Amino acid sequence: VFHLIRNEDLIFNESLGQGTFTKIFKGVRRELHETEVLLKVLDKAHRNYSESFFEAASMMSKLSHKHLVLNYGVCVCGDENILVQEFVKFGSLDTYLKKNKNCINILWKLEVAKQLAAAMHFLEENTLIHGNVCAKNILLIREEDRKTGNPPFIKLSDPGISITVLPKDILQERIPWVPPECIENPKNLNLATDKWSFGTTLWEICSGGDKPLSALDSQRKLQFYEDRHQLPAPKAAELANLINNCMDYEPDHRPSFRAIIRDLNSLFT
Amino acid sequence: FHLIRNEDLIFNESLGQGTFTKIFKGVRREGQLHETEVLLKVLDKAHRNYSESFFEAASMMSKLSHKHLVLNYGVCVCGDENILVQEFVKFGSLDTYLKKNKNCINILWKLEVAKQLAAAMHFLEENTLIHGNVCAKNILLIREEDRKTGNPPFIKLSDPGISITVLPKDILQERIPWVPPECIENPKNLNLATDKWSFGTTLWEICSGGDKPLSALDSQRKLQFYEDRHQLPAPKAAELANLINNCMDYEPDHRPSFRAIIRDLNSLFT
Ligand SMILES: Nc1ncnc2c1ncn2[C@@H]1O[C@H](COP(=O)(O)OP(=O)(O)OP(=O)(O)O)[C@@H](O)[C@H]1O
Ligand SMILES: Nc1ncnc2c1ncn2[C@@H]1O[C@H](COP(=O)(O)OP(=O)(O)OP(=O)(O)O)[C@@H](O)[C@H]1O
Ligand SMILES: [Mg+2]
Ligand SMILES: [Mg+2]
Numbered sequence: 086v087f088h089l090i091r092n093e094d095l096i097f098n099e100s101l102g103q104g105t106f107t108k109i110f111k112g113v114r115r116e117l118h119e120t121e122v123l124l125k126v127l128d129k130a131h132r133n134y135s136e137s138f139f140e141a142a143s144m145m146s147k148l149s150h151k152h153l154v155l156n157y158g159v160c161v162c163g164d165e166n167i168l169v170q171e172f173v174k175f176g177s178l179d180t181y182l183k184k185n186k187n188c189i190n191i192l193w194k195l196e197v198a199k200q201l202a203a204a205m206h207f208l209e210e211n212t213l214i215h216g217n218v219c220a221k222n223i224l225l226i227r228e229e230d231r232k233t234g235n236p237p238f239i240k241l242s243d244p245g246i247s248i249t250v251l252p253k254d255i256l257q258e259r260i261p262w263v264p265p266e267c268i269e270n271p272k273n274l275n276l277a278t279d280k281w282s283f284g285t286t287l288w289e290i291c292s293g294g295d296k297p298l299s300a301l302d303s304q305r306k307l308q309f310y311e312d313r314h315q316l317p318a319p320k321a322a323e324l325a326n327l328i329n330n331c332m333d334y335e336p337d338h339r340p341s342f343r344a345i346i347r348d349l350n351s352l353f354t
Numbered sequence: 355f356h357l358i359r360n361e362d363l364i365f366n367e368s369l370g371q372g373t374f375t376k377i378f379k380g381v382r383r384e385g386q387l388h389e390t391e392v393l394l395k396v397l398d399k400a401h402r403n404y405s406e407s408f409f410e411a412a413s414m415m416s417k418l419s420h421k422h423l424v425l426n427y428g429v430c431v432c433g434d435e436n437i438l439v440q441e442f443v444k445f446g447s448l449d450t451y452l453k454k455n456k457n458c459i460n461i462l463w464k465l466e467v468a469k470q471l472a473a474a475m476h477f478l479e480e481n482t483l484i485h486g487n488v489c490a491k492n493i494l495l496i497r498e499e500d501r502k503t504g505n506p507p508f509i510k511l512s513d514p515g516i517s518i519t520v521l522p523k524d525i526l527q528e529r530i531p532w533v534p535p536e537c538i539e540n541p542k543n544l545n546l547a548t549d550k551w552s553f554g555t556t557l558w559e560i561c562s563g564g565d566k567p568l569s570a571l572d573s574q575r576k577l578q579f580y581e582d583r584h585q586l587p588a589p590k591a592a593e594l595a596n597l598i599n600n601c602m603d604y605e606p607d608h609r610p611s612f613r614a615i616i617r618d619l620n621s622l623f624t
Contacts, residue, residue, distance in 0.1 A: 087355050089409050133433035140357040140430075158355070159431060161405035166431050 087146040088158035090114060090169050095160055097124060101176070105246060105255075106131035107168075114157065114169060122157060125168040125243075134246045135166045141216075141244035142168055148211055152204035154224060154240045173240055175228065179220035182294025191321055192354060193229055194290045196236045198324070199349050204241045205283060206342035209276055216274055217245040218282035219262050220289035249274050260306040261285045261297045261316060265334055268310060277336035283345070284316075284331030291319040291328075323352065355413055356428035358382070358439055363430065365394055369446075373515045373525070374401040375408070379442060382427060392427060393443075397436040405436055407517045412438050415513045418481055422474035424494065424510045443494030443510060451495050452564025461593055461624055463499055464560050466506045468594070469619050474511045475553055476612035479546055486514040486544055488552035489532055490559040519544055527573035531555050535580045536606055547606030553615070554586075554601025561589030561598075593624060 094115040101109040101123075108126040113119055127135060142156040155171035175181060178197070182189060201223065208215060222245070227238035248256060248263060249271045256263045256271065264281035266273040288297050297316050298306055313334050318325030327348050333339045340348075362383045369377035378394040397408045412426040426440040445451060448467070452459065471493065478485060492515070496508040518526055518533060519541045526533050526541065534551035536543040558567050567586050568576055583604055588595035597618055603609045610618075 087357070089355055089406065089413055091406055135431045135433045136360045140359055143355075143357040161402065161409070161431070161436070164402075166433070 086155075086157060087143045090158040090160045092160055092162040095122075095124065095162060095167075095169070106134060111172065112169075121172045122169050123172045125170070126162075126165045127167065129164045132164075132166060134250060137247040137250055138245065139166065139168060141247065142170065144213055145243055148207070148213065150204055150207045152200050152240055153207070154242050156243050168243065170243055171240070173224035173226055175225035177221045178223035178225055178239060179289055179294055179296075181225050182220060182290065182292075184294070186293030189293065191323060193237060194321075195324075195349065195352060195354065197223075197239055197290060198287060199346065200237075200239050201241065201283070201286070202342050202346045202349055205279055206346060208279070209342050212276065213244075214274060214276055215241070215244045215279050215282075216248050217262075218279050218286050220286055220294065223286070247274070248278075254303070257303040257306055260303075260310060261288075261332070264336070265310045265313075266336060268307070275336070277339055280331045280336075280339035280342070280345075281333075283342075284328045284339075287324055287328050287331070288316050288319065291321055291324050293319075355409075358428040358430055360430055360432050360437075363392075363394065363437065363439065369393075373521070374398070374404055375515070382439060390427070391442045393440050395438040395440075397438075399434050402436070404516045404520060407520050408436060408438070408515070411515055411517060412440065412513045414483060418477070418483070420474055420477045422470050422508075422510050423477070424512050426513065438513070440513065441510075443496055443512075445495035445498065447491045448493040448495055448509060449490035449559060449564050449566070452490065452560065452562075454564075456563035459563070461591055463507060464591075465593070465619065465622060465624070467493075467509055467560060468557055469616065470509050471511065471553070471556070472612050472616050472619060475549055476616060478549070479612050482546070484544060484546055485511070485549050485552070486517050486519075487529075487532070488549050488556050490556055490564065493556070517544070524573065527576060530573070530576040530580065531568050531586060531602075534606070535583075535604060538577075538580060545606065547609050550601050550609035550612070550615075551603075551606070553612075554598040554609075557594055557598050557601065558586050558589060561591045561594055563590070593622065 096113045098111045101111060103109060106128050110124045110126065112122055112124045114122045127138060139159045145153060146156040157169045160167045160169060222242040224240045224242055226240050229235060229237045248267055256268060262282050262285045264278050267278060285297055298309060315329050315332060330340050364381040364383060365378045367379040369379055371377060376396040380392055380394040382390040382392050409429055416426045424440050426438060428439045430437040492512040494510050494512055496510055499507045518537060526538055530538060532552050532555050534548050537548055555567065585599055600610050
């Protein structure tokens, strides 16, 4: 479901901040059914990024999976082209991780990875490239009910603005999420890209929400890939092996999400 | 509502302009190749306020299928621009075709076209779908009449374009007599009855060898025509004068249904 949602049917509320060329607001849609939704308002300055920001969310709308956020449609809401998608109560994971680095143990982290890998495998099967996998773009639907054992639940946000059109300056600032082959030529974006980013994303999860290579600058980030280094194993290096397998400078050596799911399940609960 | 990547769109010839649109013959690119001939309508950023209407004009035009409706492959929220991708009908608009071969077309040729048109309108009426801009221009000729092969012409109805519910009154008044009197005094009166009126006027074009009714009248003399409650003169052929008037009934509730319009057209043996 990807419809041309009208500005008349959208009510904006509180702003959740801004992002990569977007202003984020909580709102409501009127279809009569009123439904809470997330509104990513593409700034008018960067309005030329719409041909990929929304076309990607569109293809993700055609597919169905319990771990893919629902992208409802688009609005030519005035001077801005806006994305209307499902709202997630607890927001991005990268923040939730840092806010609860201690309480979050190994079992909690493992279930999240399984849920993510499931969505990535789904995308791989459907051959849909995300291009922006990261603990930021992972949204927490449900917390862990320890006393009841209820597992957490996550949903993968929309693909976003393609890295095939973003400026090279921000691509280098996005290392180690943007894989090497894409830094070399952005037109190398392929399914293998998300495997690398999955490794970087897994590092975030194991690191209690920390950010890989936050201290380095773009030039030093460029050298890390030049020297073909690898991310360090977090303080809880139970998954360190799988990270490096995904962050493999040879794209064809990065394991399929089918095999990755097996590894994750092999780690027991 | 399918979104296409701009790179896949290859502009070529320019087919003039439409209602706040620049028309281009182009190609779609899409695994080996995938070169599809298409029609490109570009909505300027100066006219971004007509986005919802310009898009919705083709959105619902595609949610259903019919052999006499043009197929819209997709659109682009291309940022600065907004583009519509639809099938390219070879021979172009019917109004022009009728004039280019005015002294060479017969009634059976014209009547066959009317039935095809009514068929499309009937399909739309059943689905509670309003076109809003029925005219010989928005009618595109797929195939010519092959006398030797004894096969008929074929046509399709293009999208409505930007809805008259948002166009300026100056445009509406100039679109008379295609805009029904009830919409000239309130565009929000647009309903299924609007198309029956517009259909009758479109038939008048067909019978007139491609000419356009009320051409030598300004928008002010056109307004008096509706105020005086006049009717369009009978065509030189004079076969469908009644059906036109029946369709162009100043009372919307009395305008016939396309179900019945098809019977009368089928009833016209000639
Ligand atoms: N679907 C959503 N539901 C709830 N909160 C969301 C949703 N999408 C984004 N957010 C919130 O947006 C903030 C982060 O936005 P973010 O930077 O990911 O936006 P963006 O423009 O999509 O970025 P990018 O395309 O670079 O990933 C966080 O508060 C996150 O909780
Ligand atoms: N689908 C099509 N296939 C082939 N030619 C087309 C098609 N649509 C338009 N054209 C050509 O474009 C010319 C002008 O187009 P037209 O005026 O119908 O555009 P428009 O933007 O749809 O306008 P309007 O909103 O006023 O109906 C037509 O005479 C015809 O030559
Ligand atoms: Mg995001
Ligand atoms: Mg048209």
